[PDB]
Design a protein around this ligand. Structure first.
Ligand SMILES: [Zn+2]
Lengths: 288, 327
């Protein structure tokens, strides 16, 4: 990415990029990278040959200063994360001068620095704080607050990247998807607001599995029970979100599973009428 | 088709919208006609007044029958009786003279006039009842008289009965609107619900599904669900069955059965008879659609209904023996 951003017209960005090249390329990590990377047949070797803590993060305003200030928000998040002692790798510490002027770098390295910080977390000290802050951010987004889609899509990308990270302890992909203590219904609704139907459906399934596991361990459960429990606790009905996902995705026969053709609520009846192209009764239903 | 002259094309469109259960759409369409067309012909003005009184559009301001009916309804809503009685008398005189001026010779032509005069008489009776006060016994006797007369109108056509039912619904809505909070309000609400369900069966027997749906919507607007489901849930299930929505009706009826058989506690014989009717309806539906083998559904529904009816037949009432015979 540094090589890609080194060839732009702006001079500050390329100066920062070459300084980063000189910094990381002079470390032992750069030497090990060169030793591993010398065997491949890539002209990048020719290109790069000549170049050879919790107090500062707890702030409700710092996490959501989103009033047409997405770039400032990501920049200040990156600065506050790098200045803390959580970061350990030199390459994850010396990127400050360049990321301050490049907007896309902050977005593309925020999940990397988050994962690096959570790797060295002890006794879930950082895990709980980050989970609470991310949950608060999602709740703020769900407020009726009119935030630009860039923040939600960046957070969805971060969550998707963190879902693919292997847990240091023994576990499965189910434990991998729960790197942070979150309920995925809110993230699914956010993805629905961003037209990310597949990710929203996956997150809804993950949340349903988590609720089922929690109920099973509490005892040691139909779709309507889960929907009413989500409405009571979270405030958002899971059944309606699943119906919206199955309708907007265009799948032929998927809305009937969530209650299509068997739900007394007028909304489901209207959705079924639209899906089955029964416009004659649909118009009567809308008027009625 | 645009070749039809607008003199009758607009009337046909309005009639089709009325018979399709569309009220707000008809109101907006009529407002658009008023915007695009300035002058009003007698026929379209009469249809406008009919839609105004039928939809309770009190915002909109010789006189036709529908105009006189709307004026009488507005006067009744304003606690004015002199103009109300005068308007009803004028409507009666106009209808009688218009009917007798023609050559007659046809029985079928008498039916609309008879229906209009019956509506005027019903409004007169309502005004007499509401002249000074309303009591439970008076409302009960009025409702039983109306039900008896509707029984006399079983063989009549739905076209001549629909205005009567619409006027009755409007009257009950007006009484509900201007009723103080007491047990009388509950009695009027129950009477309104019963009238709406009777209208639902009346329209269902004439291959109509939009008016029963509107009646169920009004019931849901007024009545509320509870632990013990009433007969209007069963009526909604039947209406959805008539709309070729077999799955939804079956699911609703199964939910009703699950609610009834777990929280019956012999609270009311009416609940017992409606449970028996629901079981019989479910058995008939499963027999007709054949979603399951007869062996289990028969024992689950038909014998259960038979034994429920036979275990509490100590009153020998007609409303129980007819249900037992039907089961
Ligand atoms: Zn907002």
């Amino acid at each position: 990415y540094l090589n890609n951003t080194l060839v732009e017209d702006c001079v500050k960005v390329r100066s920062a990029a070459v300084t980063c090249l000189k910094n990381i390329l002079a470390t032992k990590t750069g030497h090990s990278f060169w030793e591993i990377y010398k065997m491949t047949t890539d002209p990048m070797l020719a290109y790069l040959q000549p170049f050879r803590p919790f107090e500062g993060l707890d702030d409700i305003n710092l996490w959501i200063p989103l009033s047409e200030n997405h770039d400032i928000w990501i920049k200040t998040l990156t600065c506050a994360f790098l200045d803390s002692g959580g970061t350990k790798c030199e390459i994850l510490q010396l990127l400050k001068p360049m990321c301050e002027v490049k907007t896309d770098f902050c977005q593309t390295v925020l999940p990397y620095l988050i994962h690096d910080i959570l790797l060295q977390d002890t006794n879930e000290s950082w895990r709980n704080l980050l989970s609470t802050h991310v949950q608060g951010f999602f709740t703020s987004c769900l407020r009726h607050c009119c935030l630009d889609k860039k923040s939600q899509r960046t957070m969805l990308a971060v969550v998707d990247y963190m879902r693919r990270q292997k847990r240091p302890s023994s576990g499965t992909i189910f434990n991998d998807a729960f790197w942070l203590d979150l309920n995925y219904l809110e993230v699914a609704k956010v993805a629905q607001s961003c037209a990310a139907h597949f990710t929203a459906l996956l997150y809804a399934e993950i949340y349903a599995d988590k609720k089922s596991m929690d109920d099973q361990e509490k005892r040691s459960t139909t779709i309507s029970s889960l929907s009413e429990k989500s409405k009571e606790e979270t405030g958002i009905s899971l059944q309606d979100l699943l119906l919206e996902i199955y309708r907007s995705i265009g799948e032929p026969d998927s809305l009937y599973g969530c209650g299509g053709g068997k739900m007394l609520q007028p909304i489901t009846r209207l959705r079924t009428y639209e899906h089955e192209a029964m416009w004659g009764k649909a118009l009567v239903t809308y008027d009625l | 088709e645009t070749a039809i002259p607008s003199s009758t094309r607009q009337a046909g469109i309005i009639q089709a919208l009325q018979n399709l259960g569309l009220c707000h759409i008809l109101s907006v369409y009529l407002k658009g006609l008023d915007y695009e067309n300035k002058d009003w012909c007698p026929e379209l003005e009469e249809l406008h007044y009919q839609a105004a009184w039928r939809n309770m559009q009190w915002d909109h301001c010789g006189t036709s029958y529908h105009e006189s009916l709307y004026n009488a309804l507005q006067s009744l809503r304003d606690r004015e009786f002199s103009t109300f009685y005068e308007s009803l008398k004028y409507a009666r005189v106009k209808e009688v003279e218009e009917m007798c001026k023609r050559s007659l010779e046809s029985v079928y032509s008498l039916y609309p006039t008879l229906s209009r005069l019956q509506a005027i008489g019903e409004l007169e009776s309502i005004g007499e009842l509401f002249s000074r006060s309303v009591t439970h016994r008076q409302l009960s006797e009025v409702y039983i008289k109306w039900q008896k007369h509707s029984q006399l109108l079983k063989d009549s056509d739905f076209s001549f009965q629909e205005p009567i039912m619409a006027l009755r619904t409007v009257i009950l809505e007006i009484l509900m609107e201007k009723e103080m909070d007491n047990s009388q309000r509950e009695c009027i609400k129950d009477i309104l619900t019963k009238h709406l369900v009777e209208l639902s069966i009346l329209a269902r027997t004439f291959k109509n599904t939009q008016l029963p749906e509107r009646a169920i919507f009004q019931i849901k607007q007024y009545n509320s669900v509870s632990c013990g489901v009433s007969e209007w849930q069963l009526e909604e299930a039947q209406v959805f069955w008539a709309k070729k929505e077999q799955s939804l009706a079956l699911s609703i009826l199964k939910q009703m059965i699950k609610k009834l058989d777990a929280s019956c506690a012999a609270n009311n014989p009416s609940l017992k008879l409606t449970y028996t009717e629901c079981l019989r309806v479910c058995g008939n539906w499963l027999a007709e659609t054949c979603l399951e083998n007869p062996a289990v559904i028969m024992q689950t529904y038909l014998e259960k209904a038979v034994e429920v009816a036979g275990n509490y037949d100590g009153e020998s009432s007609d409303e129980l023996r007819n249900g037992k015979m039907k089961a």
